[PDB]
UniProtKB/Swiss-Prot annotation:
It is found in: Cytoplasm. The chain holds residues 129 to 496 of 1800 of the full protein. Coiled coil: none annotated. The gene is WNK3. This is Serine/threonine-protein kinase WNK3. Expressed in brain, lung, kidney, liver and pancreas, and in fetal tissues including placenta, fetal brain, lung and kidney. Very low levels of expression were also detected in fetal heart, thymus, liver and spleen. Isoform 1 is brain-specific. Isoform 3 is kidney-specific. Residues 19-277 form the Protein kinase domain.
Amino acid sequence: MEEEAEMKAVATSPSGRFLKFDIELGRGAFKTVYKGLDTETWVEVAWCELQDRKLTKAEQQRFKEEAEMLKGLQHPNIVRFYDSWESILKGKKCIVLVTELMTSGTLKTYLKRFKVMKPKVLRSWCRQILKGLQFLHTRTPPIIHRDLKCDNIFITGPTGSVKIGDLGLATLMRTSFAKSVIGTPEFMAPEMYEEHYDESVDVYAFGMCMLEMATSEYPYSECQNAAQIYRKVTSGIKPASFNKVTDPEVKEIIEGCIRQNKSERLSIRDLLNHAFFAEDTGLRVELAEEDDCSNSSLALRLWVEDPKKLKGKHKDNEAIEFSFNLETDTPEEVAYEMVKSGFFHESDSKAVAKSIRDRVTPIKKTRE
């Protein structure tokens, strides 16, 4: 039984397609989001009201057209923008943005409580933010998100896909004041407060999102306030949580993204070509426990990411926990022990041994 019958429509788009309900979903300076309805599809939408009062006639016409540019953005990793128009709020001009309503919330809400699910969702959500950003940066003229952070990444579900939303509008962030209210220091590149920055601010913010997804903790939480973060960021002092990244590949991508010098930062084109984003083997090995160099034995986990890529009747999300002595063991012999125990068919030995070798050869080198 639905009580959608009691929700009274309080406004309509000039087109007539969308209805506004007086149910506020979120706030912020310059923005109020409302529950809305599409009368063509009968699906609840977000009715967003955007307004900067202290805006000139010239600035307002540039903000209205920036809003109209978003309508033509269609990509599976970008929240869909259905329509935008100019209206009046408290006598002054305002912009209304109608967008898809994300019911499973943000990545920020998700990471407050939950770790990203295993075996593949971390790699997928990363690749999806990169694909979404790449799409925005390849528009004519290029779009820069300007406000990328976990609270602006929406999830379809814990095993679903991610969508970037709440783009930072160029005209709405022209000033140091607007940037200080809109932006989240943790996710902001050091050059964010300069009058001129490019798309590499979005790369820096991506690096911080990925850090948060990897460490399951908030970047720069050691800081008491935003001034301390600004001081640390501009000094070239990484978040303490960066040294909590246990995967060398994940630590490498992050550092290449959160580089102080904008020109030294990694490009999305090349990131998308990183081996970390490959899924050809269908097998991956990770550390199960925190590695103490006093120990000779590691505690590892083998993930069957793709049961189709293997001979036999394998279940989804299959994870094998096994020990490995860095001194006396070999990946090829351990893969044979997996075959013998009945985990794998003999013909998958080479694929198993490689997944083990990939994780175990770097750690063995580090040992003294």
